[PDB]
Design a binder for this molecule. Structure first.
Ligand code: KVB
Ligand code: KVB
Length: 238
């Protein structure tokens, strides 16, 4: 019982997500192969490889948001305020989406697959990596399809409570149709489990905390002179 209008909205979202991601292929610094043991330079090269993946992701996320129906109707100031806050959360959703529970690794851009050890080997701290993997496993147990991921991202974008939002009324009104679509879609997909929808919305709660956990990781780089490139530092370093 999805209405025609809801079906159309969902098609648009899934088509946009697909196109934007394919556009992230249409060259990152390599993962260091052939390094010496305990190497300063190897570690920095790993970190640099990761910062460049993050820079690819942020561009994909902005490109996707611009395609989300209603986003560009908002004032430009609100567009920026919404994307600034949602970028890390959407990035962690797309990360969770690429977790393989069999291997316990994350695969980025098809070719780049990494373990907890590999993230640690690049200089990221256990206090950040562990909750990300915990979240990824919890996301895996939900079994979201492409429509559910796209809808959840749209809902995340139109959060009226982000810092410096000018027209929170308009933002909340834009969130409504996407919340309503996800409610309808989840009922049809799994009618016997009436909790899958609350459990999904609850992942937005966890993402808020992960953003805070991420802020602490960013801060921990300041007392080990391992700083972010300027682009990432602008959106992430307070
Ligand atoms: O834009 C492009 O064509 C390509 C591109 C894609 C990604 C990035 C880096 O990744 C991000 C992620 C979250 C937001 C922005 C961001 C934008 C970006 C933006 C654009 C349109 C609507 C909304 C947001 C614009 N202006 C910002 C400003 C300000 F002070 F206002 F100048 C401050 C802080 C962030 C921003 C950037 C930079 C470029
Ligand atoms: O694959 C596709 O098709 C699309 C796609 C392409 C790329 C990506 C993201 O790619 C990555 C890969 C490795 C790390 C990050 C990264 C994160 C995010 C993060 C952190 C730990 C583990 C997983 C993810 C957060 N913070 C970082 C910081 C910090 F200092 F903390 F600011 C520094 C450097 C990297 C990071 C990002 C997603 C989707």
């Amino acid at each position: 019982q999805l209405t025609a209008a809801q079906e159309l909205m969902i098609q648009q979202l899934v088509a946009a997500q697909l196109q934007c991601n394919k556009r992230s292929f249409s060259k990152v610094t390599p993962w260091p192969l052939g390094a010496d043991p305990q190497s300063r330079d190897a570690r920095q090269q790993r970190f640099a490889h990761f910062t460049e993946l993050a820079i690819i992701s942020v561009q994909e996320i902005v490109d996707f948001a611009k395609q989300v129906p209603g986003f560009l109707q908002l004032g430009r100031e609100d567009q920026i305020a919404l994307l600034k806050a949602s970028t890390i959360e959407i990035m962690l959703l797309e990360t969770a989406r690429r977790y393989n529970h069999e291997t316990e690794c994350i695969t980025f851009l098809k070719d780049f697959t990494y373990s907890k050890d590999d993230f640690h080997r690049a200089g990221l701290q256990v206090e950040f990596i562990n909750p990300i993997f915990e979240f990824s496993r919890a996301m895996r147990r939900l079994g979201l399809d492409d429509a559910e991921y796209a809808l959840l991202i749209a809902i995340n974008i139109f959060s009226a409570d982000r810092p410096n939002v000018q027209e929170p009324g308009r933002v909340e009104a834009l969130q409504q149709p996407y919340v309503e679509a996800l409610l309808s879609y989840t009922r049809i997909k799994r009618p016997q489990d009436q909790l899958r929808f609350p459990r999904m919305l609850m992942k937005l709660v966890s993402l808020r905390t992960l953003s805070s956990v991420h802020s602490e990781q960013v801060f921990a780089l300041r007392l080990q002179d391992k700083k972010l490139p300027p682009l990432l530092s602008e959106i992430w370093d307070v």
